Amino acid sequence: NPKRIRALKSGKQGDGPVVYWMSRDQRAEDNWALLFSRAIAKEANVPVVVVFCLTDEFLEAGIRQYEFMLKGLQELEVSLSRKKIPSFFLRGDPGEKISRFVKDYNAGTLVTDFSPLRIKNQWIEKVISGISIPFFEVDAHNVVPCWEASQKHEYAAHTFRPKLYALLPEFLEEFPELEPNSVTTLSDVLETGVKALLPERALLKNKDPLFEPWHFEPGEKAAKKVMESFIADRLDSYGALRNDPTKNMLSNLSPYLHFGQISSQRVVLEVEKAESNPGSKKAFLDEILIWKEISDNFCYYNPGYDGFESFPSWAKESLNAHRNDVRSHIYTLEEFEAGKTHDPLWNASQMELLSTGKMHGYMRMYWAKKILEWSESPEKALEIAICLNDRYELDGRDPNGYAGIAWSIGGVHDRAWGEREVTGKIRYMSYEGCKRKFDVKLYIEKYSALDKLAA
DNA sequence: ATCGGCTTCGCGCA
DNA sequence: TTGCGCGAAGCCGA
Ligand SMILES: Cc1cc2c(cc1C)N(C[C@H](O)[C@H](O)[C@H](O)COP(=O)(O)OP(=O)(O)OC[C@H]1O[C@@H](n3cnc4c(N)ncnc43)[C@H](O)[C@@H]1O)c1[nH]c(=O)[nH]c(=O)c1N2
């Protein structure tokens, strides 16, 4: 389906390899990008090669994301050579490195997947300028190409959802089988990059790592076994138990989908054919279909996705009007980060975020709204809630991150509610509201250990 | 074209 | 808990 490609640059198709510049979608199956690279490599009797660019951004988050990512690449690499596609791994800025790699190996054609974040689009430009062969983009990450789904920033779910469903019958389709190439250190990069990151690993008073790395096992292989678990054990109770922090009825797929270790489209396919509770199947389909992809919609059509300016006008006008309110408490980053607020429900969730790297969905909503209530300005609430989300979430640094922080503190894709001190018309949430929805003390007590335990 | 109808709200009440 | 009505509130879209 040609609608999944955009022509970034046009030109002289080299007598050489087709180059997949892998970035978002780190999987070898279920990958429209690797499929397109392999299509036009067959139309030219050239091999297809894969190149990944490892960049200095790993220092801005934690060992947890980097071991999750790097382990997934060790397994993609052997999985990619079993079908005769060599994987190449460059360490440097994709501005210069991908550029050089193009000239150096005589690439016939270049291809990349699609991120809507600002920095991938800075790179793509530095790539287009220092390059002579054609340059192609494929949305391998959304069921419906970001730029076809809609042509504007979408105001709400219920306005984006019809456009999306109207296009679902044509892009919800099976994946062809990736045919292997006809014509014919990462251990070490994992070593250095953890050495450089070990001085900042989150520790306990007894020098122990806070992080528990057994809750999510990385890779394509482990990814698919988590979807199969979810469809067989959890999908049915999803409508009813998804909002109860005390049960793991979440799919648990976000760390894998973030790193593109599983296609969102293979999951939809496999939910769609499964015979579960309708309400479960609907609730679930609109998270992974609508909300995931309005988040790409958000970050694409809004360059300042991660700042106050991108809130809707009414919530900008609201929070401004309450900047001069006395705040009940005020915390610093350090105080939040170590869960030293006055709110054991708040502090429990921050403990869940540090030791697992995935905080319960429903709780992240409460977490983010309390940052706005108990910090000195909204801009500073944004800053903390981004800092902590990207530092400690396994699925962080993600359009779902930005659009969800935005949802919580700024009202993006939300509506106006009853006007309050500090938080204005932004949707309010309370401990007492939690108490009627789920057994807070069970939550709190699962994590009440790790408080005194941390320094 | 004006009017439901809006992710995940809180709260009383049975 | 567990469900329902009602509240406050800005705006898109057929
Ligand atoms: C403050 C805050 C911070 C974040 C987020 C929300 C909030 C309120 N989210 C979005 C959401 O909280 C997160 O995707 C889910 O908790 C992922 O958990 P499961 O995969 O178990 O979801 P679950 O199995 O319930 O849902 C299925 C899938 O749908 C998608 N999805 C679900 N809820 C979504 C939402 N609210 N927005 C967008 N997509 C959603 C995800 O891909 C998720 O994997 C996010 N998400 C993320 O992937 N990375 C992040 O760093 C953040 N950050």
Ligand 1 centre to CA of A178 (Å) is: 29
Is A395 annotated to bind ligand?
yes
Nearest nucleotide to A158, CA against C1' atoms? B6
Regarding whether A97 and A205 lie in a shared domain, the answer is: no
Q: Please check whether residue A402 is in contact with residue A258, taking contact to mean a CB–CB distance below 8 angstroms.
A: no
Provide, in whole angstroms, the distance separating residue A137's CA from nucleotide B12's C1': 54
Q: Which residues contact A19 (CB under 8 A, 6 or more apart)?
A: A37, A48, A49, A50, A51, A101, A102, A105, A107, A108, A109, A110, A111
Tokens of residue A102, six digits = 């193009």
Is A99 annotated to bind ligand?
no
Q: Please check whether residue A431 is in contact with residue A345, taking contact to mean a CB–CB distance below 8 angstroms.
A: yes
Residue A398's SS3 state is coil
Provide, in whole angstroms, the distance separating residue A383's CA from nucleotide C6's C1': 36
Regarding whether A294 and A318 lie in a shared domain, the answer is: no
Last residue of a domain, one of A140, A155, A170: A140
Q: Please check whether residue A208 is in contact with residue A202, taking contact to mean a CB–CB distance below 8 angstroms.
A: no
**For residues A19 and A48, what is the distance between their CA atoms, to the nearest angstrom?**
6
Beta carbon of A368 within 6 Å of any ligand 1 atom: yes
Ligand 1 centre to CA of A194 (Å) is: 27
Regarding whether A279 and A381 lie in a shared domain, the answer is: no
Resolved by: X-ray
Neighbours of A433 (CB within 10 A): 10
Last residue of a domain, one of A278, A301, A324: A301
Is A173 annotated to bind ligand?
no
* Window A120-159, strand B contacts by Cβ < 7 Å: 156-158
**For residues A345 and A245, what is the distance between their CA atoms, to the nearest angstrom?**
11
Q: Please check whether residue A296 is in contact with residue A400, taking contact to mean a CB–CB distance below 8 angstroms.
A: no
Regarding whether A270 and A320 lie in a shared domain, the answer is: no
Beta carbon of A38 within 6 Å of any ligand 1 atom: no
Mutate to test the pocket of ligand 1, among A290, A305, A395, A412 (most ligand atoms within 8 A of CB): A395
DSSP A237-272: GHHHHTT-TTS--S---HHHHHTTSS-HHHHHHHHH
| Number of domain units in chain A | 3
Tokens of residue A411, six digits = 């009202």
Q: Which domain holds residue A6?
A: 2-140
Q: At what angle do helices A118-129 and A97-105 cross, to 10 degrees?
A: 40
Ligand 1 centre to CA of A398 (Å) is: 10
Neighbours of A334 (CB within 10 A): 8
Indicate whether A149 belongs to any domain.
no
**For residues A20 and A177, what is the distance between their CA atoms, to the nearest angstrom?**
17
**For residues A422 and A330, what is the distance between their CA atoms, to the nearest angstrom?**
12
Regarding whether A135 and A45 lie in a shared domain, the answer is: yes
Nearest atom (ligand 1) to Cα of A405: 1
What single-letter DSSP state applies at residue A30?
Answer: S
Regarding whether A226 and A116 lie in a shared domain, the answer is: no
**For residues A436 and A421, what is the distance between their CA atoms, to the nearest angstrom?**
24
Regarding whether A241 and A295 lie in a shared domain, the answer is: yes
Mutate to test the pocket of ligand 1, among A238, A254, A412 (most ligand atoms within 8 A of CB): A254
Residue located nearest, by CA, to atom 42 of ligand 1? A254
Indicate whether A435 belongs to any domain.
yes
Residue A131, sorted as left (phi over 0), alpha (psi -120 to 50) or beta, turns out to be beta
Q: Which residues contact A325 (CB under 8 A, 6 or more apart)?
A: A421, A422
Is A25 annotated to bind ligand?
no
Residue located nearest, by CA, to atom 31 of ligand 1? A287
Beta-strand relationship, A5-9 and A135-138: antiparallel
